[PDB]
Amino acid sequence: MALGSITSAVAVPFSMQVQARLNYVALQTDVLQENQKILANAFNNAIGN
Amino acid sequence: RKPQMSDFVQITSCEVTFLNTTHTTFQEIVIDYIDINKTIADMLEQYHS
Amino acid sequence: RKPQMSDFVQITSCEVTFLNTTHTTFQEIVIDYIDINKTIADMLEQYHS
Ligand SMILES: *[C@@H]1O[C@H](CO)[C@@H](O[C@@H]2O[C@H](CO)[C@@H](O[C@@H]3O[C@H](CO[C@H]4O[C@H](CO)[C@@H](O)[C@H](O)[C@@H]4O)[C@@H](O)[C@H](O[C@H]4O[C@H](CO)[C@@H](O)[C@H](O)[C@@H]4O)[C@@H]3O)[C@H](O)[C@H]2NC(C)=O)[C@H](O)[C@H]1NC(C)=O
Ligand SMILES: *[C@@H]1O[C@H](CO)[C@@H](O[C@@H]2O[C@H](CO)[C@@H](O)[C@H](O)[C@H]2NC(C)=O)[C@H](O)[C@H]1NC(C)=O
Ligand SMILES: *[C@@H]1O[C@H](CO)[C@@H](O[C@@H]2O[C@H](CO)[C@@H](O)[C@H](O)[C@H]2NC(C)=O)[C@H](O)[C@H]1NC(C)=O
Ligand SMILES: *[C@@H]1O[C@H](CO)[C@@H](O)[C@H](O)[C@H]1NC(C)=O
Ligand SMILES: *[C@@H]1O[C@H](CO)[C@@H](O)[C@H](O)[C@H]1NC(C)=O
Ligand SMILES: *[C@@H]1O[C@H](CO)[C@@H](O)[C@H](O)[C@H]1NC(C)=O
Ligand SMILES: *[C@@H]1O[C@H](CO)[C@@H](O)[C@H](O)[C@H]1NC(C)=O
């Protein structure tokens, strides 16, 4: 998931990975910074529980 | 393949993830995108010549 | 998002399930639907003015 390009050791940020995986469900038109927060905080509280 | 206008959905944001483009170089990128206003002035001067 | 003309397939029936619309309010619903016949009369009177 962190690696997408074979012949370049630069890596993709994980927030780009989730934002891409939202588009296969439905094509996201407008994206906001607030949507990143509520996904992440519910994710981090899920792992702690 | 070359792009057509039917592959582009129009939204309002165009964040930094996109490709920076101006009006004149849009028309050589995509095929058969025809702004009619520049075209009609060509056949107008060709008619009265 | 706003609609474009590439999302509309043309058939012949238009039963009661549809949305009732006239010609002038079709053009503000969908973007860049251009009937050329109304447009060319605008640049024709603007040319000889
Ligand atoms: C297991 O899962 C549960 C369920 O999510 C987790 O419980 C959550 O814990 C977090 C962290 O304590 C809580 O989030 C915090 O909420 C605070 C406000 O809560 C009060 O007000 C709200 C309404 O605004 C009421 O709904 C609520 O009842 C309270 O009265 C905020 O002050 C916190 O935000 C502040 O700090 C964060 C940094 O930490 C900054 O980001 C904000 O800018 C701000 O200053 C905060 O988000 C959350 O409310 C809890 N949920 C529930 C249902 O109680 C457990 O933590 C989790 N177990 C783990 C992870 O081990
Ligand atoms: C396309 O051009 C715009 C206009 O400059 C670029 O937007 C800038 O992005 C940088 C980095 O995020 C900001 O510091 C500037 O403030 C932005 N400018 C404006 C006017 O918003 C955009 O990054 C360019 N896209 C590229 C180079 O891919
Ligand atoms: C759009 O307008 C047409 C035209 O009136 C409506 O069609 C009528 O539908 C009713 C109910 O089925 C019939 O009793 C009429 O005979 C129909 N009229 C014609 C001329 O066929 C249609 O229902 C309207 N669509 C709506 C309101 O959603
Ligand atoms: C882009 O927009 C600016 C802002 O009005 C304008 O000055 C410029 O001419 C535009 N570029 C074109 C039309 O190529
Ligand atoms: C062409 O020019 C006319 C004259 O102002 C304008 O009304 C019309 O919207 C233009 N067509 C475009 C921008 O596609
Ligand atoms: C709709 O069709 C009728 C039937 O010919 C016509 O009289 C009317 O003008 C049309 N509406 C338009 C062109 O807006
Ligand atoms: C525009 O008007 C001409 C003149 O009758 C007609 O032949 C043509 O089909 C019209 N264009 C349309 C309806 O798109």
Side-chain angles (χ1 to χ4, degrees), chain B residues 21-39:
Chain B
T21 319
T22 196
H23 266 85
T24 177
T25 175
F26 183 75
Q27 284 107 25
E28 307 106 14
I29 285 180
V30 68
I31 196 171
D32 215 321
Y33 165 69
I34 306 306
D35 175 38
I36 312 99
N37 271 335
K38 56 195 63 192
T39 63

Side-chain angles (χ1 to χ4, degrees), chain A:
Chain A
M1 323 205 172
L3 169 82
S5 71
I6 304 104
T7 73
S8 71
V10 306
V12 56
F14 196 77
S15 67
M16 191 168 307
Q17 175 68 237
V18 172
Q19 186 45 61
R21 278 166 194 273
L22 272 189
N23 297 286
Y24 275 69
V25 176
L27 176 56
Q28 305 289 329
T29 69
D30 174 37
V31 64
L32 312 176
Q33 304 304 311
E34 306 184 340
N35 315 320
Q36 310 316 294
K37 309 266 197 174
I38 320 180
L39 293 187
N41 301 332
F43 183 40
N44 291 291
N45 298 307
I47 312 295
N49 280 271

Side-chain angles (χ1 to χ4, degrees), chain C residues 11-43:
Chain C
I11 46 162
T12 52
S13 310
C14 70
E15 45 265 53
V16 298
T17 59
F18 284 73
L19 173 56
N20 271 318
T21 319
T22 196
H23 266 85
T24 177
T25 175
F26 183 75
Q27 284 107 25
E28 307 106 14
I29 285 180
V30 68
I31 196 171
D32 215 321
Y33 165 69
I34 306 306
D35 175 38
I36 312 99
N37 271 335
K38 56 195 63 192
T39 63
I40 179 172
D42 292 330
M43 295 72 81

